Write a structure and sequence with these properties.
heteropentamer; A mainly beta (about 210); B mainly beta (about 210); C mainly beta (about 220); D mainly beta (about 200); E mainly beta (about 220); C: about 220 residues; Immunoglobulin-like; seven-stranded mixed beta sheet; five-stranded antiparallel beta sheet; about 50% strand; D: about 200 residues; 2 domains; 12 strands; binds a molecule of 3 linked components (NAG-NAG-BMA); viral protein/immune system
């Protein structure tokens, strides 16, 4: 079993610094090639940097002189020090186990790095009341940056949950909706709560959605 | 640098059929190529390395072929979970480069969307803005026309659309259209309607409410 | 033996780009690195950089990093030195020097390429006599070659026949951006009445030929 | 009185794999370096700290000629202060290297239709090589905490990889024969001089 | 990073005598266990490209005469010319090539040291053709003198001139090892006709007292 877990992503102003960490288990970090691969939102994959099993490091031309890759054998962790960040550096950064600087056989789930001068803002949660198979949902509006996680009645309600991808409004903020499919029998006898979490702004909102 | 070109840009097949994906390179790389599968919301998974060798845990139905600057990924007896973007990556020379990917969706029987319309909440209405949401739930194919009609007048330019990924089980889509208006503009009209045009509907379906 | 051939002299306005070349030939050229050396008028030698034509392995002096680009074309054994935007301070002589390997002395040198960067335009000289005055048997006379651009100017006396006692001074750059020059000759004082002395000034860049007689 | 055997090295029919690079000890002979730098078959003749044209009038206690085959893209790694798979794990030059690196394309000799897989390079090593160090180990590389017991598998990689030399590949992919000249002055009696 | 300093800046050596040029290095110029000082000496004659004379601080290159010898080790190096000849007039540079970036010395100017020769002074009034153009130039000529040091001052009606004169000096003659100098006083036509006496005052080692050549405007 192999695990790669990235951390350290978040909002950062242009020209700032951000340091990414990748904890690894199931193999010896100091004995393997390791790489960082980033994927811009909605676009393809781009290789960023590699560290050889012997410690030698290489970087893509677009990030050379600004990024530094390193490892800590005692902590079994891979680091990516990012400096002089630019708007075009906004991407999901993947930790990847590299086989001899050829191909990436294991990948971490990735961490999101957003480079922008915009400020963090918590979302506003509004109900989507049903009317008399029924449907209902919650509206998550005016938050920045990504992401937002939505759940219904803690983790109880999972079937029929549709959380749409966020849209970027002309105001520069993101909006998102999560809807569920439920029978008309329950009405208000069964209580529905949507749980909205926005970690960048530390916002935790529970919204009761009852018919009107 | 070496540029990798993938064809088709997107692909659509039913379960149980065979998928053929292509990848061409600017220069020959002589089997120094690999294939990756990236399902939505998840990291890429290695499928093929060396243009012929399958990675551990990969079913035999996935097959890689080709050499030089011609490469092919063959996927036989498709399943609904095989919907993902497939990338080819070369390591013949530095820097390593990827393809732009191939979007592969899973076909199914045409399903009629279930249309729901949500009037804006009262708590939102106290803040000076109004949002009206129209829901298209569990439909196939993805192509669908959503038109906002307010007092039978076609409204444009103040709505945004979001559509979910293919469901893992029934391979259905879900679409939401959000009409955004100020509070003053919201109360200038009486009837808000959502008209949905889809292949699975004999005639367009209209869902409306009165403010 | 390796020989280096450089491109011709360049006269450019400030802000214009420029690329000069240095092509090498001869046996053992495969072992040669091509370096560039700058020498401003009347000053010392400055090492700018060096390149191996085979793989374009280029090393720059820190004083010239980012100011110039050094490249090579291994198919024609030619090394280049170019500026994106020229300044007036770039006016100098640029030699290319070859060394058999790096961290070795530069044993072969090109003739050099003169680069002049100035806002001045091409202008023909005005030639004025330096008339003799009265002796001790020795008379001095000359010609004043004033307000020309660019370098150089050739000056001869009696269509090249008179050479003994001739001093053609190096040009001085005036505050106007134009060059001025003088040439003088030592002649016997008794020949002023009999002999006639003519200075021949030719300025190729402006297509000017002036034959001026210097009489008392 | 006897010619130094440079011809046996440069014109050898077979060259060694870079991980197992050959070394020829040159001693007690007169060397004529002019047959090297006046040649036209070489595409790369890079010397550091010494001029080949000045080698015919110098004396050294010993001279070493190392030969191997690598890709064209990796030829730039055979140089002082360089980094890469070849420079770190197969053949490493010191930062103060005093000698010559000579390379030439050998696609006709070392490449065959269908691929010449006889030339190997080391792919995995836990630490970089010291300058002028040869590591010919073929033991399974242990990439995890579990001992491999000599069988390839998960976290157990064979340390060597094969070049896929095919004549129709690009210039960087084509085989190149490399000869590295090392000049040593041990303050002992010198026996490798040029012609007098 | 390695700075090379030469001593002296200018050197005057008589024909056949010994010329000594020193080069000081801020750091050692070794390269490896070769135990060789990576120092070079170059010769640049007037109007000519530099010519390599000595490498590794003592080994003269092919074709270099035997009077050129290099010595020194560590950070102190010396170039010596045994039999000084008129052909050897040039600027001599020391260069280190142990590592990049290469650095030259500032250069040492070498000239023939001959016996003192006084200059012959001539003064030329502006031509009437040039006066018609609105500018006046007065030229003072110092011919065939040594050493090159000379003070030339312009006095207009016994008033010292500043900023309106330029001097030009020839290279040393290959036969008599002398110099020639020209000083040009440039004035506007209006400024030229407001004064009468234009004097060129020359001070040189070979002159007992300053020599003055002067003329009167239109007289
Ligand atoms: C490896 O073998 C090659 C031949 O494939 C050797 O190159 C040959 O070297 C000889 C000298 O030993 C050259 O002969 C000379 O040729 C010139 C005319 O170019 C002539 O003026 C001389 O009198 C003399 O005959 C010969 O040209 C040269 N051939 C080629 C094709 O370069 C090479 O010397 C061998 N390597 C070593 C290290 O000995």
């Amino acid at each position: 079993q192999v695990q790669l877990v990235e951390s350290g992503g978040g909002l950062i102003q242009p020209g700032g610094s951000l340091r990414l960490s990748c904890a690894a288990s199931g193999f010896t970090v100091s004995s393997n090639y390791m790489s960082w691969v980033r994927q811009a939102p909605g676009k393809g994959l781009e290789w960023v940097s590699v560290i050889y099993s012997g410690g030698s490091t290489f970087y893509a031309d677009s990030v050379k002189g600004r990024f530094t890759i390193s490892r800590d054998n005692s902590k079994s962790t891979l680091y990516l020090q990012m400096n002089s960040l630019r708007v075009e550096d906004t991407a999901v950064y993947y930790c990847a186990r590299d086989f001899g600087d050829f191909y990436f056989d294991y990948w971490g789930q990735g961490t999101l790095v957003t480079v922008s001068s915009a400020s963090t803002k918590g979302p506003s949660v509004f109900p989507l009341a049903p009317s008399s198979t029924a449907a209902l949902g919650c509206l998550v509006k005016d938050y920045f940056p990504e992401p937002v996680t939505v759940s219904w009645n803690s983790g109880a309600l999972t079937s029929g949950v549709h959380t749409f991808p966020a849209v970027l409004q002309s105001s520069g903020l993101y909006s998102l909706s999560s809807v569920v499919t439920v029978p008309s029998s329950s009405l208000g006898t069964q209580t529905y709560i949507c749980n909205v979490n926005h970690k960048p702004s530390n916002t935790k909102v529970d919204k009761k959605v009852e018919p009107k | 640098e070496i540029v990798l070109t993938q064809s088709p840009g997107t692909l659509s097949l039913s379960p149980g059929e065979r998928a053929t994906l292509s990848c061409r390179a600017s220069q020959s790389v002589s089997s120094y190529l690999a294939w990756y599968q990236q399902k939505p919301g998840q990291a890429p998974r290695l499928l093929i390395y060396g243009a012929s060798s399958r990675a551990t845990g990969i079913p035999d139905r996935f097959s890689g072929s080709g050499s030089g600057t011609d490469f092919t990924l063959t996927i036989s007896r498709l399943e609904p979970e095989d919907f993902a973007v497939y990338y080819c990556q070369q390591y013949g020379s530095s820097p390593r480069t990827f393809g732009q990917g191939t979007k592969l969706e899973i076909k199914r029987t045409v399903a009629a969307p279930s249309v729901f319309i949500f009037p804006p909440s009262d708590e939102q209405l106290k803040s000076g803005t109004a949002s009206v949401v129209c829901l298209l739930n569990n439909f196939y194919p993805r192509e669908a026309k959503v038109q906002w009609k307010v007092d039978n007048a076609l409204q444009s330019g103040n709505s945004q659309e979001s559509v979910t990924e293919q469901d893992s089980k029934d391979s259905t889509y879900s679409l939401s259209s959000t009409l955004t208006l100020s509070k003053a503009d919201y109360e200038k009209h009486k009837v808000y309607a959502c008209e949905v045009t889809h292949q699975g509907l004999s005639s367009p379906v209209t869902k409306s409410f009165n403010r | 033996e390796v020989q280096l051939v450089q491109s011709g002299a360049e006269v450019k306005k400030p802000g214009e780009s420029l690329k000069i070349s240095c092509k090498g030939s001869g046996y053992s050229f495969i072992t040669y690195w091509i370096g560039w050396v700058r020498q401003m008028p009347g000053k010392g030698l400055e090492w700018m950089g060096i390149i191996y034509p085979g793989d374009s392995d280029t090393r720059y002096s820190p004083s010239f990093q980012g100011q110039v680009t050094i490249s090579a074309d291994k198919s024609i054994n030619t090394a280049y030195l170019q500026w994106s935007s020229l300044k007036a301070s770039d006016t100098a002589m640029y030699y290319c020097a070859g060394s058999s390997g790096i961290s070795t002395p530069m044993d072969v040198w090109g003739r050099g390429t003169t680069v002049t960067v100035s806002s001045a335009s091409t202008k023909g000289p005005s030639v004025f006599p330096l008339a003799p005055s009265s002796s001790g048997g020795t008379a001095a006379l000359g010609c004043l070659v004033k307000d020309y651009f660019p370098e150089p100017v050739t000056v001869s006396w009696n269509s090249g026949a008179l050479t003994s006692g001739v001093h053609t001074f190096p040009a001085v750059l005036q505050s106007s951006g134009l060059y001025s020059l003088s040439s003088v000759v030592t002649v016997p004082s008794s020949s002023l009445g009999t002999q006639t002395y003519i200075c021949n000034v030719n300025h190729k860049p402006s297509n000017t030929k002036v034959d001026k007689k210097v009489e008392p | 009185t006897n010619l130094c055997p440079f011809g046996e090295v440069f014109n050898a029919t077979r060259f060694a794999s870079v991980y197992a690079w050959n070394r020829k000890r040159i001693s007690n002979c007169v060397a004529d370096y002019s047959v090297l730098y006046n040649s036209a078959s070489f595409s790369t003749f890079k010397c550091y700290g010494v001029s080949p044209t000045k080698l015919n009038d110098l004396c050294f206690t010993n001279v070493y000629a190392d030969s191997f085959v690598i890709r064209g893209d990796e030829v730039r790694q055979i140089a002082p202060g360089q980094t890469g798979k070849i420079a770190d794990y197969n053949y490493k030059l010191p930062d103060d290297f005093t000698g010559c690196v000579i390379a030439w394309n050998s696609n006709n000799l070392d490449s065959k239709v269908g691929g010449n897989y006889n030339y190997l390079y080391r792919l995995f090593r836990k630490s970089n090589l010291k300058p002028f160090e040869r590591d010919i180990s073929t033991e399974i590389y242990q990439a995890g905490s579990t001992p491999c017991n000599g069988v390839e598998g998960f976290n157990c990689y064979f340390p060597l990889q094969s070049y896929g030399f095919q004549p129709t590949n690009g210039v960087g992919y084509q085989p190149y024969r490399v000869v590295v000249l090392s000049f040593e002055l041990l303050h002992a009696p010198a026996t490798v001089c040029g012609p007098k």
